[PDB]
Write a structure and sequence with these properties.
1 chains, alpha/beta, six-stranded parallel sheet, 45% helix, DNA-binding, Helicase/UvrB N-terminal domain-containing protein
DNA sequence: TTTTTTTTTTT
């Protein structure tokens, strides 16, 4: 049993000669400390090519962090404030996790410095005990010996519980042979369930006072059965687990530990970082849907009178719930939640109603009519009938439900960091009689005045259908995405985790196959690290040193292959000489229907051309064909034709060619890939392998062991400082199914499909018009071929294509022994896409540089297109948000938050009409214009927000500029200017890129300017202004009180609607004197006196005075006559 | 119109 004292004389300053990659990581994490501070989290994308020491670099970094923990615990043992810093290595696949853990242990055992072993054997045994691996519960159980499990059963005294013994004995007997695959499946399921039950029980006995003292052999048994217990005990602090397991958490003897809730100080290495976007998304898609009607009715019913203890452990918690209770009661009153809900009229059973919302501005309903919601009081029910109100009810219910979950999170934190979590949740839920929401709270744990983004608002999909078993009651089954994977990653960085994301394509410019790095840059700022120009040059030099193709005479040959229908026809005729025609051959022997013949001829021609060019090559021996489909038994007819062509060219060129059709993932499971390696090692001749992009994923190592007898003189080492070799010829078909679509069960709601459309709209890849059309077509059912057609129009699609190609040649370049000639055969459809690659080539692989250079040899701005789309989106969001805010203000009473939002928006626009940088907390009041300080547009501000256009696409259109609001005239007034300078309002528009959107300029900025000018002039003339109260807010601008007059005065600053207004005001406040005034205009225009009906009358009988101009537009001079005559009219009261 | 194969974990 080793101990920490083994490193007492260990030299922590002796480290191996660091590679430039290690130096780059160390330097970048050093500047992180300087710029962001010690406690700050970070994200460091590392575009390292795999096969040039990526795994060694990551694991060596992991080993260094293990040493610094030992060093700290030696030097600071007397401090007592022990902080066992957690290190994680996560990746998507189980095989890569296990392989990396094995490689770390091997690195510990066999690392040397200066020719001497790095660690003594006791030191090695100490480090290897700090490392833990956390598989799924089934495999965790099946790893354990019967001795260990019997020990933990006896020590916790479950060895007397009949069900436990029966289940364990059944599992052991099943495990006794377990050779058959279905036996393995059954054993897996049984082991998972039994492990769940056993941990549930032992957590029970450890929770109560009957604490079993773990020590020695029993302690080791538990630590083997529960590897997470070592982390809780402080005995281990390095974990190897998958992304799915990381998101779900792992058990110890107390409870389940969620790494996401305790990310402060953690260092997290994520292999294939961009792949984890899709994995995290798949985990977020799997949440359980919830009926909103039932949820809101339960919340309203239980919060009506149930209350908590009023003890010191519940301080300030009821105050967290007080707003939610008020909202629940008002909601239940407005929508009459005493009654249940049902549909009326149109056959709901014929087709259910589906509603989609992004919670901000993209709303789509499957019903062709606008469904409304009526509370019948005779038939006491709420009826959903087709004449909207149903979407309003659903949106409000969703808001209240999410509010309840967020308030529960806040109450859990107020109650307290993670051992207290379960107790807090159970105490709060049991005090309120809300135990039915326990699972929802457990899963859920992980506005114009704010930063708005899809990535932290997500989406909602609501399905309205009849309840199960009833034909007269309807439920609202809602499934949510509360955040995108980018939001989760940014949350981890903000929680304090240092994330080291390693992938050759870590910064691919796609939001479908990678995180949104525009959003991550906005949200993390400079906590999103980036290796610099000099660092990238050093890494490029290091990669060149290890892959010196040019000095060693290795030649990369790239050929783009078009379709070869004539040559394919010749081969087809030779394959079946007695058949009449080639199309007949395809239709009959190959099985290609006439509809698919044009495509199958298109792709089989290029593949066979590549194979012929490979076999005709003299000394190449290893060809990998990467297609989109597996050539297996389901395509056996096509294989035979390919096999015939291979045999023909083998006879013609006198080289035997072994073909490996259908190397599937399950094939590589049952029949290992080393069969190809063994054949290349022992048999003379060429090899052709037929795989797919999805089959040859990360971690599949395709190199083979070199046998110098068979290789000839073709191989040559390219490394400067030095036997295996790799692929020498590759065929790259154009990747096809590039929208994420998992076929299995949890994707039945198509939530992952709306996520992609909303991500593309967020990025600026789609206009809001296209995004909303695509969302509508998705809701009403959509062919994958049509969704894929929609996706193909983006530039995100092309970035994803290049990402797929860049990894294919990266995974096949894993050794330093190369042929004198490497053949790259590319589908011609990739030539246009690869020609458009324009990023910095410093970290590209040599094969990818060759592909791009060949594509460019035969030869639209994306940021501009993004600017147009984002201008439209920022306008549309402001357009819909203002209408909702105005609607809520006009629904009296107006809540405090709505008034605060209105004033905050107006104040922000007044102080900052333009901003130099992209704002954080008011980002969607503005748009980034192509011309600084001004822009043009064209669209109906009262009409459709999708039908807006913008910069030079509309050269003759309405201008948004400082001139068009006459701000310069406004400030030249002698009274307005001191008011503006004291209030901090802008006297002029800065020439900046971000200018306010057309909706803000027309509907808010101009009105705020007018109101501020009026209040500026009148305040200098003994007028006192009071706040309009919430009963009739936004009907009139200001309460006015003048010295010597006690009749209440009402102000409007810019006829039957106005009649409704003046009646509504005088109903509450009695007769009052009203002012209608425009701040700017012609002072020579006569002043009007109107009655309650806006009819001209005598000044003494008039109730409303209309001043056509308060300040002269010609020279900013105050209309003194108007003010004096208004004062005289006030004195006539 | 475009034209598929892969995966983890708890339940």
């Amino acid at each position: 049993n080793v101990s920490i004292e083994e490193f007492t004389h260990f030299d922590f300053q002796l480290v191996p000669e660091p590679s430039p990659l290690d130096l780059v990581i160390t330097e970048s994490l050093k500047n992180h400390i300087e710029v962001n501070g010690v406690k700050s989290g970070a994200l460091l994308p590392l575009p390292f090519q795999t096969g040039i020491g990526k795994t060694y670099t990551a694991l060596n970094f992991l080993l260094q962090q293990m040493l610094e923990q030992v060093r700290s615990e030696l030097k600071e043992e007397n401090t007592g404030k022990k902080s066992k810093r957690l290190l994680y290595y996560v990746t998507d696949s189980v095989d890569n996790v296990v392989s990396a853990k094995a490689d770390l242990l091997k690195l510990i055992e066999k690392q040397t410095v200066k020719g001497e072993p790095r660690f003594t054997l006791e030191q090695q045994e100490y480090l290897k005990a700090q490392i833990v691996h956390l598989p799924n519960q089934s495999e965790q159980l099946l790893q354990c010996s019967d001795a260990v499990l019997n020990d933990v059963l006896i020590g916790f005294n479950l060895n007397a519980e009949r069900d436990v013994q029966a289940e364990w004995s059944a599992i052991s007997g099943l495990r006794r042979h377990a050779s058959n695959p279905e036996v393995k499946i059954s054993l897996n399921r049984q082991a998972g369930y039994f492990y769940r039950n056993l941990i549930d029980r032992l957590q029970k006995k450890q929770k109560g006072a009957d604490r079993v003292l773990l020590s020695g052999s029993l302690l080791a048994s538990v630590e083997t059965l529960l590897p997470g217990e070592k982390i809780r005990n402080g005995s281990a602090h390095v974990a190897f687990l998958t992304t799915s397991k990381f998101l779900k958490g792992f058990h110890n003897t107390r409870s389940r530990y969620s790494p996401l809730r305790d990310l402060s100080g953690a260092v997290l290495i994520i292999d294939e970082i961009d792949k984890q976007n899709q994995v995290i998304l798949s985990e977020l898609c799997k949440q359980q849907a919830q009926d909103l009607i039932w949820a809101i009715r339960t919340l309203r019913a239980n919060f009506r009178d149930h209350q908590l203890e009023s003890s010191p452990r519940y301080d300030k918690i009821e105050d967290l719930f007080e707003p939610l209770r008020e909202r629940l009661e008002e909601f239940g009153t407005n929508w009459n939640l005493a009654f249940a809900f049902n549909t009326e009229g149109a056959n709901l059973n014929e087709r259910p109603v589906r509603l989609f919302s992004d919670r901000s501005f993209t709303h789509v309903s499957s019903a062709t009519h606008k469904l409304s919601l009526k509370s019948d009081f005779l038939r006491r029910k709420n009826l959903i009938f087709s004449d909207g109100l149903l979407t309003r009810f659903v949106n409000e219910a969703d808001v209240i439900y999410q509010w309840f979950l967020g308030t529960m999170r806040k109450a859990v934190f107020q109650y307290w960091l993670e051992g207290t979590f379960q107790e807090a949740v159970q105490s709060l839920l049991t005090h309120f009689n809300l135990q039915e929401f326990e699972s929802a709270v457990y899963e859920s744990f992980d506005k114009l005045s704010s930063s708005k983004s899809y990535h932290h608002t997500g989406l909602k999909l609501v399905e309205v259908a009849h309840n199960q078993g009833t034909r007269d009651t309807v439920n609202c089954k809602a499934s949510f995405l509360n955040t995108s994977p980018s939001g989760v990653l940014a949350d981890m960085v903000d929680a304090g985790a240092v994330i080291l994301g390693i992938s050759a394509t870590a910064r691919a410019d796609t939001v479908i196959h990678n995180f949104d790095f525009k959003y991550l840059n906005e949200r993390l700022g400079n906590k999103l690290l980036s290796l610099s120009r000099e660092q990238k040059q050093r890494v490029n030099n290091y990669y060149h040193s290890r892959r010196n193709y040019k000095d060693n005479g290795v030649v990369l040959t790239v050929k783009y292959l078009n379709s070869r229908d004539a040559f394919l026809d010749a081969l087809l005729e030779e394959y079946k000489p007695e058949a009449r025609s080639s199309h007949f051959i395809l239709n009959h022997y190959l099985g290609i229907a006439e509809s698919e013949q044009a495509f199958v001829r298109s792709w089989l021609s290029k593949l066979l051309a590549s194979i012929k060019a490979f076999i005709s090559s003299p000394d190449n021996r290893y060809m990998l064909s990467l297609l989109n489909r597996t050539l297996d038994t389901t395509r056996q007819n096509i294989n035979d034709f390919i096999q015939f062509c291979c045999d023909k060219w083998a006879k013609e060129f006198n080289v035997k060619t072994k073909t490996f059709f259908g190397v599937n993932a399950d094939w590589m499971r049952l029949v290992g890939y080393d069969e190809i390696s063994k054949h290349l090692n022992t048999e003379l001749g060429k090899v052709v392998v037929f795989s797919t992009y999805a089959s040859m994923g990360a971690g599949k190592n395709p190199d083979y062991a070199v046998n110098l007898a068979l290789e000839g003189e073709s191989l040559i080492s390219v490394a400067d400082v030095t036997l295996r070799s790799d692929i020498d010829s590759i065929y790259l078909e154009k990747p096809t199914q590039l929208l994420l679509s998992d076929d299995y069960s949890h994707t039945a709601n198509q939530l992952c499909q709306f996520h992609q459309i909303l991500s593309l709209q967020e990025n600026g890849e789609l206009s809001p018009k296209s995004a909303e059309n695509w969302c509508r077509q998705q809701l009403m059912g959509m062919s994958r071929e049509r969704s894929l057609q929609q996706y193909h129009q983006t530039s995100d699609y092309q970035s994803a294509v290049r990402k797929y190609i860049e990894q294919a040649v990266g995974r096949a370049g894993r050794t330093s022994l190369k042929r004198k000639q490497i053949l790259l055969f590319v589908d011609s459809g990739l030539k246009e896409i690869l020609a458009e690659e324009s990023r910095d080539p410093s970290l590209f692989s040599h094969e990818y540089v060759a592909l791009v250079n060949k594509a460019k040899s035969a030869g639209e701005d994306r940021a501009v297109r993004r600017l147009f789309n984002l201008a439209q989106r920022n306008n549309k969001d402001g357009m819909l948000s203002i209408k909702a805010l105005v609607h809520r203000l006009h629904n009296q009473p107006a809540s405090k938050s709505d008034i605060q939002e209105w004033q905050d928006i107006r104040t922000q626009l007044l102080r900052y009409p333009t901003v130099a940088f992209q704002p954080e907390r008011f980002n969607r009041l503005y748009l980034q214009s192509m011309t600084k300080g001004y822009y043009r547009y064209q669209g109906n501000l009262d009409g459709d927000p999708n039908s807006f256009e913008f910069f030079d696409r509309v050269p003759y259109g309405d201008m948004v500029s400082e001139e068009d609001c006459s701000l310069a005239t406004l400030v030249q007034n002698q009274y307005v200017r001191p008011w503006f300078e004291r209030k901090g309002f802008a006297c002029s528009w800065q020439k900046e890129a971000n200018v306010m959107t057309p909706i803000m300029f027309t509907n808010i900025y101009k009105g705020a300017l007018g109101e501020q000018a009026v209040e500026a002039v009148l305040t200098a003339f003994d007028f006192t202004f009071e706040e309009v109260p919430n009963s009739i807010y936004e009907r009139f601008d200001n309460r006015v009180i003048f010295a010597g007059i006690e009749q209440p005065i009402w102000l409007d600053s810019k006829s039957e609607g106005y009649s409704s207004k003046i009646a509504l005001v005088e109903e509450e406040f009695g007769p009052s004197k009203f002012i209608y005034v425009n701040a700017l205009g012609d002072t020579s225009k006569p002043i009007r006196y109107l009655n309650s009906c806006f009819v001209e009358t005598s000044p003494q009988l008039a109730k409303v005075i209309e001043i056509p101009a308060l300040i002269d537009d010609s020279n900013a001079d105050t209309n003194r006559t108007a003010v004096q005559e208004l004062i005289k009219w006030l004195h006539h009261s």
